[PDB]
Design a protein around this ligand. Structure first.
Ligand SMILES: *[C@@H]1O[C@H](CO)[C@@H](O[C@@H]2O[C@H](CO)[C@@H](O[C@@H]3O[C@H](CO)[C@@H](O)[C@H](O)[C@@H]3O)[C@H](O)[C@H]2NC(C)=O)[C@H](O)[C@H]1NC(C)=O
Ligand SMILES: *[C@@H]1O[C@H](CO)[C@@H](O[C@@H]2O[C@H](CO)[C@@H](O[C@@H]3O[C@H](CO)[C@@H](O)[C@H](O)[C@@H]3O)[C@H](O)[C@H]2NC(C)=O)[C@H](O)[C@H]1NC(C)=O
Ligand SMILES: *[C@@H]1O[C@H](CO)[C@@H](O[C@@H]2O[C@H](CO)[C@@H](O[C@@H]3O[C@H](CO)[C@@H](O)[C@H](O)[C@@H]3O)[C@H](O)[C@H]2NC(C)=O)[C@H](O)[C@H]1NC(C)=O
Ligand SMILES: *[C@@H]1O[C@H](CO)[C@@H](O[C@@H]2O[C@H](CO)[C@@H](O[C@@H]3O[C@H](CO)[C@@H](O)[C@H](O)[C@@H]3O)[C@H](O)[C@H]2NC(C)=O)[C@H](O)[C@H]1NC(C)=O
Ligand SMILES: *[C@@H]1O[C@H](CO)[C@@H](O[C@@H]2O[C@H](CO)[C@@H](O[C@@H]3O[C@H](CO)[C@@H](O)[C@H](O)[C@@H]3O)[C@H](O)[C@H]2NC(C)=O)[C@H](O)[C@H]1NC(C)=O
Ligand SMILES: *[C@@H]1O[C@H](CO)[C@@H](O[C@@H]2O[C@H](CO)[C@@H](O[C@@H]3O[C@H](CO)[C@@H](O)[C@H](O)[C@@H]3O)[C@H](O)[C@H]2NC(C)=O)[C@H](O)[C@H]1NC(C)=O
Ligand SMILES: *[C@@H]1O[C@H](CO)[C@@H](O[C@@H]2O[C@H](CO)[C@@H](O)[C@H](O)[C@H]2NC(C)=O)[C@H](O)[C@H]1NC(C)=O
Ligand SMILES: *[C@@H]1O[C@H](CO)[C@@H](O[C@@H]2O[C@H](CO)[C@@H](O)[C@H](O)[C@H]2NC(C)=O)[C@H](O)[C@H]1NC(C)=O
Ligand SMILES: *[C@@H]1O[C@H](CO)[C@@H](O[C@@H]2O[C@H](CO)[C@@H](O)[C@H](O)[C@H]2NC(C)=O)[C@H](O)[C@H]1NC(C)=O
Ligand SMILES: *[C@@H]1O[C@H](CO)[C@@H](O)[C@H](O)[C@H]1NC(C)=O
Ligand SMILES: *[C@@H]1O[C@H](CO)[C@@H](O)[C@H](O)[C@H]1NC(C)=O
Ligand SMILES: *[C@@H]1O[C@H](CO)[C@@H](O)[C@H](O)[C@H]1NC(C)=O
Ligand SMILES: *[C@@H]1O[C@H](CO)[C@@H](O)[C@H](O)[C@H]1NC(C)=O
Ligand SMILES: *[C@@H]1O[C@H](CO)[C@@H](O)[C@H](O)[C@H]1NC(C)=O
Ligand SMILES: *[C@@H]1O[C@H](CO)[C@@H](O)[C@H](O)[C@H]1NC(C)=O
Ligand SMILES: *[C@@H]1O[C@H](CO)[C@@H](O)[C@H](O)[C@H]1NC(C)=O
Ligand SMILES: *[C@@H]1O[C@H](CO)[C@@H](O)[C@H](O)[C@H]1NC(C)=O
Ligand SMILES: *[C@@H]1O[C@H](CO)[C@@H](O)[C@H](O)[C@H]1NC(C)=O
Ligand SMILES: *[C@@H]1O[C@H](CO)[C@@H](O)[C@H](O)[C@H]1NC(C)=O
Ligand SMILES: *[C@@H]1O[C@H](CO)[C@@H](O)[C@H](O)[C@H]1NC(C)=O
Ligand SMILES: *[C@@H]1O[C@H](CO)[C@@H](O)[C@H](O)[C@H]1NC(C)=O
Ligand SMILES: *[C@@H]1O[C@H](CO)[C@@H](O)[C@H](O)[C@H]1NC(C)=O
Ligand SMILES: *[C@@H]1O[C@H](CO)[C@@H](O)[C@H](O)[C@H]1NC(C)=O
Ligand SMILES: *[C@@H]1O[C@H](CO)[C@@H](O)[C@H](O)[C@H]1NC(C)=O
Ligand SMILES: *[C@@H]1O[C@H](CO)[C@@H](O)[C@H](O)[C@H]1NC(C)=O
Ligand SMILES: *[C@@H]1O[C@H](CO)[C@@H](O)[C@H](O)[C@H]1NC(C)=O
Ligand SMILES: *[C@@H]1O[C@H](CO)[C@@H](O)[C@H](O)[C@H]1NC(C)=O
Ligand SMILES: *[C@@H]1O[C@H](CO)[C@@H](O)[C@H](O)[C@H]1NC(C)=O
Ligand SMILES: *[C@@H]1O[C@H](CO)[C@@H](O)[C@H](O)[C@H]1NC(C)=O
Ligand SMILES: *[C@@H]1O[C@H](CO)[C@@H](O)[C@H](O)[C@H]1NC(C)=O
Lengths: 478, 478, 478
């Protein structure tokens, strides 16, 4: 009789890479790179505030078109590419840092304060910002002007007796001409100094014209300061002051701003990237560099294929007809032929493979408030450094992704081939003296074995001592 | 007779991770992460200067409480969290960069210079800083004031004829009111310009009040400049100048500032982290991100366990009673039973393992003057970038730490199992025709072997040709 | 008869490292680190502009010695260490960022514009810059001075109607004394404001002396601005303005500036580093950190050696006399002795090795406009961060380089040893019942085999069934 061992095969397998062969065919594989976003942003679990025609700093400052964004909270704020301001010409030095400061807070919560003013007009206004069909300037700021042709030195103090750091927004007027500096503040000049016990800032208005924006040559410049609990805010001004009306609370938490043109719909996802959510499963993605939340690592690879199967088609060609397992038996006897899979080695191969997959898939990390990655301006050294570090990070993670897959696939191939050899060796021991290894993965059995002993051999209940004499008479002619 | 091969076992082993199994039990393991500091900082080999109630910049500037820190040197300066200033209100633009500049120098060495002054008071003083029970301002600065109701334009030059870069510290007075600007400098204003052949700086005093600190509304602002050898320092001032009295030497070397609350005691260590020294041995640590000197890499893992043993409990269950080696023999003869370890395979397994440990343990790198990692203020973009790069570095090193251990443990397991198989195969050859492999790691010997031939087999001096006929008559009945 | 298997050997092999043994000897190896530059820079394929005695910013500004650099283009600009300026004392705030801005553009293309000036002298000049044996100042700038003892407020506009971002260079005069501020601009002071619809800048001249450079106490300060298409440039000035004469085009592409003292010759190379080109082949280099173009990664290792051979000198000592392959046969018969290599296993070992080499060698990445890595000044926090990230990048790539080689060499050794064992096992099957394994890698053949059957065994055409009876009579005496 003849008892053969072998393994299954697939008529059409797939291609994976390995550290030693570069291109090999395997029976089964799984992709590790998510290369497709939905095209829509999910509104759960993260809270998303959709800034339609409003940058975050316009909502912060107050703008007639952004009146719908007051005391809002978000985990993620979405800034649209179409946003434009619709108010008095605005200029913020280092606004990029202001934008970060109020992005990470997750909030536009604002509390008005009783700043005691006296001999100034406490309601300066402009036709630039139309609200309610009239002139209204910005909503969180107070443009002070002379009152009765005079502007007394304003020395006001607002102590911080609460447990919050307070963010104050204030600015300076740059009227554009001598004519207006006199008309508006009744002075040839002016100075603004703002201080705390920790730091001080000061500005000087700069008189001269600028290209007209919304028909206005003049501009407002915005500055900010933070008052720690126990400290006080002291404002010392002789003119051109656009006063705060109160403060914003500073918070620290899991929030940021993403710039993106995509609809926000009804879905659930833990990973958000500009052009929609990404399934939070495969360990790598190549959709974007900008992410929020729990996401796959970004790599430059287009694909990574991880074998879950075994090499396709000593042991003879894989059996395309094996369907009940991965490794198994085939036999010929005086009673004909048949096959059966070996479930013990099949299961071992499967669990070792699923173990490896479970260790990688679904394991992602959560990140917030990452540095800016894309730019619309040429800035110089800081920007060069930001680009540099981002590129460095990506090459290293791409490197790790490739090496890991190459090692995992090499392991997988060797992992399944050793199961085949263990099955072979085990069978040989059951038949220690009653069979010969024909060199092709089949054993020649020297007793006239029936189907029942084949079954016994397959389940390791075969007794080599009851066929010992028959086999010796057949093989050595004893 | 029967001769069995096997390996030792441990009644209670430990758990390690591998790249293929995640959780397995082994006989021996070693931790790779130092997760415990001493709680005390060592004063050797590194020289540590303990800044009690003094930040480095107060020692630099001069402060009655910091008089004990003059011309000091350090490899590491320790700044205490309780430090506070005890002098005239002080404000340094970009002090964080000044702090780095004089941190890396390792020194407060100072040399006074003969700046030729004329029609000014060359000893301005303040009640804010009490030294010797009187008014003394700061010790390295010279507050110049009017003399005889006049302040002539001070145009002084101090050439650099030495080989050192010279650091000059100087500042500008901001008196707080018009009243004092006249009283103190006899002028309505003032200007300060400082220049070299390489760069120029200028400031303008800003008059107005500030919250009173130590009962003083006025403040001093500090600026610095570096003069290269061959260049000169030119000071051009009309008032409000707080003049340098000389210069500090700039050096470059292996030094920094650490912020920490911990006692400095008597011990020796090459790795210093805020809360005490760390043994410089295990390749990774999870104590802190802030380190100085030769330290283990920081990882986010709590533990990493490296197998030094073999899988615990074909070859039958490991022998808990084996005590003289790792691999060995067990036998039964007509003369009874016994055991002996195989020292050749035992030693091979041990040396391969110790080789791997020696390659990793004790191999650390020395670092100095690293970027700041912790912050007490919200700064904007530079800070965001500093946090970003630190987090990136850590995830990558944590990744490498996990992968390395997973590979090392998988290797170790396969490494020791192959020794067992080599021993088995070798024994089989000694007994090539006189024995059968019973499939359980034991050989059936077909000659009536005594204890002396067992010893011969164990030491590879067995002659298969002298038992050949006895064995053939027993196994094939020839 | 006796048929032995073995492998070749080398009288003098080389040393490689492996993950398990640290130091082993192999027959063949290949270096992975290029540790030697040419000492000369190639002028192809990259276009190189050699700035002899000119920094890029001098060529940009215009300097009598840099008249040969107008409207030039480059992929790489080389700045020489000997460059010095030869013109009016020059000072550029944040010139390092200006230098980056015009470095990445790859060009000095300049177009003059018709700025409509009126009551000013439109040709201010200085003896500091001698061109054509006369006083000529800088070539791209226009020093405006009073004309007829007056300097009317200059409010000029230059709209951007093209598709290019335009770079304008302009500056402010700091005359050094009151005497000159009156002589030159007929005013006690002056102000300059420059603006667009996106941003604004302003400066105030600072009067006072500075160390004389080229006998001049006065200095020029340079500022720049970028005008986007559709915007306009508005210049508002009352004096001290050094006006632009036109604009430079801003481009974005594969270009940078390298600082290096090396001749540029005639060769071809894709990798440029300060001290000459580097062959673009080995995956790692340790020549420099500063690179341009397609280069090997920088590592701190001095050497990395990758085995291409097999372990040198069960299977007996390698055969130094094997010359026709790597694995082979040796035999003794009644007809004498001989040898032949096995080309099937030899070729398999070779292709697997060349596959691995092809996967690594020649695979490099192309980079442009990297951050500065070397410094000649102490700057504070930005510089500290730049150094920090560069060091981090290098340690991680050095780590990867070492681990990769250690794994590749371990693989290679196991890779070639398994071919030897496969050959052994295959031979045993051809001789399944007609031979014994003597335990030293040789088979004892029990039929009186001639040279012709040895050849048959070597080519797998041996019939074990025709010698079966002879062998059984000899080995079991049947
Ligand atoms: C910050 O606010 C305080 C308090 O209002 C200012 O102090 C006061 O400032 C005014 C205006 O400079 C002073 O009035 C002046 O009086 C002199 C003498 O008669 C006169 O010659 C000036 O033309 C002007 O009228 C006033 O004396 C002064 N003192 C107080 C406490 O009333 C302070 O100056 C402000 N700081 C800034 C930013 O300028
Ligand atoms: C400096 O020069 C600029 C550019 O010429 C001046 O800005 C421009 O001034 C003109 C008036 O001379 C403005 O035209 C006016 O526009 C308004 C609508 O905004 C219209 O109602 C008027 O009938 C008239 O057409 C022009 O818009 C304005 N903007 C630009 C940049 O073109 C600027 O005023 C000058 N500054 C001075 C003289 O100090
Ligand atoms: C830097 O120091 C130099 C040298 O002391 C200054 O030059 C001198 O500055 C003074 C004060 O501005 C000048 O005096 C002035 O004279 C004119 C004419 O009589 C008078 O109208 C002014 O009221 C004042 O008294 C002096 O002429 C001038 N020259 C020298 C060499 O003595 C320089 O101005 C200082 N720079 C700064 C920072 O202002
Ligand atoms: C601008 O307003 C602030 C806040 O009111 C003024 O600062 C404060 O001025 C008062 C006096 O009006 C100070 O009170 C005094 O304190 C000293 C001890 O430091 C004590 O000896 C006196 O008897 C009196 O109680 C107060 O300390 C001071 N500090 C703050 C921030 O509360 C500031 O002077 C005003 N600036 C002007 C008028 O220009
Ligand atoms: C930017 O350029 C514009 C246009 O040239 C300047 O506007 C003009 O500036 C001059 C000089 O300040 C003004 O002349 C002045 O007239 C008054 C009143 O007679 C006189 O008291 C002053 O002494 C001076 O002569 C002129 O009126 C003014 N307006 C125009 C459109 O002609 C603008 O001031 C410049 N901005 C800067 C940077 O100062
Ligand atoms: C402030 O002090 C500095 C240093 O003394 C003055 O700079 C120096 O001024 C002297 C003249 O007092 C210059 O000497 C002259 O040099 C020229 C050649 O450059 C020569 O032709 C003259 O015959 C004379 O020897 C000296 O070069 C100059 N430079 C330095 C830094 O030594 C500066 O002028 C003073 N500023 C004032 C008074 O405002
Ligand atoms: C953003 O602003 C633009 C301009 O105001 C809006 O476009 C207008 O939309 C309204 C209807 O809401 C139309 O009546 C106007 O005619 C449109 N003006 C044009 C042609 O620009 C746009 O809808 C706004 N989008 C939001 C709300 O984010
Ligand atoms: C830091 O400064 C504080 C305040 O001066 C010191 O605390 C004082 O210590 C002295 C003894 O040295 C006592 O007499 C005072 O009563 C303490 N004042 C209080 C209650 O704050 C502190 O010892 C200093 N620590 C050092 C030297 O670093
Ligand atoms: C850079 O500039 C220096 C100084 O002008 C040049 O050195 C001079 O070279 C010329 C010949 O071209 C000699 O006649 C002068 O005597 C040299 N002066 C000295 C001694 O410095 C140098 O050749 C220039 N190198 C270039 C062109 O990059
Ligand atoms: C992998 O095998 C499974 C059956 O176990 C099959 O459903 C799946 O489609 C296969 N995947 C590929 C891509 O071959
Ligand atoms: C990647 O793109 C291919 C082709 O569109 C698609 O079949 C595959 O599902 C994508 N991978 C994922 C899951 O993003
Ligand atoms: C703040 O605004 C609310 C608006 O309803 C008003 O009722 C309240 O009086 C204001 N308080 C202050 C401090 O101005
Ligand atoms: C505000 O300031 C004025 C100053 O005259 C004072 O009379 C008043 O009591 C202060 N308090 C108020 C009403 O806010
Ligand atoms: C300005 O107008 C607002 C309208 O809400 C009012 O509350 C505020 O008191 C006014 N301030 C003054 C006194 O001008
Ligand atoms: C989504 O992501 C980016 C844009 O944010 C871009 O590559 C592309 O539009 C989308 N898909 C791919 C290919 O990543
Ligand atoms: C294995 O199969 C044989 C078939 O003859 C049967 O006799 C024996 O009982 C079976 N043993 C097991 C494990 O069920
Ligand atoms: C490892 O084995 C050694 C004996 O060789 C023993 O002293 C040590 O405690 C063991 N370590 C562990 C943690 O099992
Ligand atoms: C880590 O912590 C555990 C529990 O306190 C301790 O047993 C172990 O020794 C620590 N590891 C080291 C050496 O830091
Ligand atoms: C510097 O200080 C020391 C203090 O002992 C003094 O002797 C010396 O004369 C001073 N020199 C200068 C340059 O002022
Ligand atoms: C210092 O300057 C004065 C200016 O009058 C001069 O007389 C003196 O010689 C100079 N030298 C000294 C004493 O430092
Ligand atoms: C200021 O006092 C110090 C005390 O040591 C003295 O050395 C210095 O010469 C004095 N300067 C002048 C002249 O005011
Ligand atoms: C020591 O290090 C840091 C504080 O610097 C902190 O995590 C903890 O207090 C200490 N131990 C640990 C758990 O790292
Ligand atoms: C090995 O042991 C046997 C025991 O009979 C002894 O005769 C022989 O000399 C020993 N050989 C060695 C290597 O000492
Ligand atoms: C490697 O072997 C080749 C022959 O195949 C030889 O030419 C080369 O010099 C060898 N390299 C080394 C360094 O041994
Ligand atoms: C490295 O240096 C050695 C010694 O000069 C040299 O033999 C070797 O070729 C160099 N490697 C390369 C190719 O740069
Ligand atoms: C620019 O310079 C060239 C030099 O040949 C001159 O012909 C042209 O007229 C100039 N154009 C302007 C706009 O000044
Ligand atoms: C330039 O400006 C003057 C201002 O008087 C004007 O007359 C002339 O037409 C303008 N155009 C030219 C010639 O550039
Ligand atoms: C300045 O001189 C240049 C020489 O090319 C000339 O083109 C320009 O028009 C002159 N400008 C004036 C009017 O001063
Ligand atoms: C070339 O590169 C750098 C200088 O840029 C320096 O290390 C050395 O001069 C050269 N060779 C080496 C050893 O890298
Ligand atoms: C192999 O060699 C033998 C030598 O006897 C020869 O008879 C046989 O034909 C050969 N077979 C092949 C593969 O050429």
């Amino acid at each position: 009789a003849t008892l053969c061992l072998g393994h299954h095969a697939v008529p059409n397998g797939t291609i994976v890479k390995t550290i030693t062969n570069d291109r090999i065919e395997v029976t089964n594989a799984t992709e590790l790179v998510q290369n497709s976003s939905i095209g829509e942003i999910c509104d759960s679990p993260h809270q998303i505030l959709d800034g339609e025609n409003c940058t975050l700093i316009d909502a912060l400052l107050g703008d007639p078109q952004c009146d719908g964004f007051q005391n809002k909270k978000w985990d993620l704020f979405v800034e649209r590419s179409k946003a434009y301001s619709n108010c008095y010409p605005y200029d913020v030095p280092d606004y990029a840092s202001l934008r970060s400061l109020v992005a990470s807070s997750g909030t536009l919560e604002f509390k008005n304060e009783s700043f005691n003013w006296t001999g100034v007009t406490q309601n300066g206004t402009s036709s630039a910002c139309i609200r309610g069909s009239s002139s209204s300037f910005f909503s969180r700021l107070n443009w002070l002007t002379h009152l009765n042709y005079t502007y007394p030195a304003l020395n006001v103090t607002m102590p911080n007796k609460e447990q919050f750091d307070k963010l104050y927004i204030w600015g300076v007027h740059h009227p554009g001409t001598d004519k207006d500096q006199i008309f508006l503040y009744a002075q040839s000049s002016g100075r603004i100094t703002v201080s705390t016990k920790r730091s001080q800032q000061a500005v000087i208005p700069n008189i001269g014209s600028r290209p007209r924006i919304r028909d206005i040559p003049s501009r407002i410049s915005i500055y900010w300061t933070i008052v720690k609990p126990g400290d006080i805010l002291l404002i010392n001004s002789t003119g051109n002051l656009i006063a705060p009306r109160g403060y914003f609370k500073i918070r620290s938490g899991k929030s940021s701003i993403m710039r993106s043109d995509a609809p926000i719909g009804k879905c659930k996802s833990e990973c958000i990237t500009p052009n929609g959510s990404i399934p939070n499963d495969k360990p790598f993605q190549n959709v974007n560099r900008i992410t929020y939340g729990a996401c796959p690592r970004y790599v430059k690879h287009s694909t990574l294929k991880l074998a879950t199967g075994m090499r396709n088609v000593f042991i003879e060609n894989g059996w395309e007809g094996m369907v009940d397992g991965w490794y198994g038996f085939r036999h010929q006897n005086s009673e004909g032929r048949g096959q059966a899979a070996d479930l013990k080695s099949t299961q071992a191969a499967i669990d070792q493979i699923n173990g490896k997959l479970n260790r990688l898939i679904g394991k992602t990390n959560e990140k917030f408030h990452q540095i800016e990655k894309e730019f619309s301006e040429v800035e110089g050294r800081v920007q060069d450094l930001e680009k540099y570090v981002e590129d460095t990070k990506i090459d290293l993670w791409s490197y790790n992704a490739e090496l890991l897959v190459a090692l995992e696939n090499q392991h997988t191939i060797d992992l399944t081939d050793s199961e085949m050899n263990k099955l072979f060796e085990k069978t040989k021991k059951q038949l220690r003296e009653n069979a010969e290894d024909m060199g092709n993965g089949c054993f020649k059995i020297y007793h006239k074995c029936d189907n029942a002993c084949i079954e016994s051999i397959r389940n390791e209940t075969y007794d080599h001592n009851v066929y010992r004499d028959e086999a010796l008479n057949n093989r050595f002619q004893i």
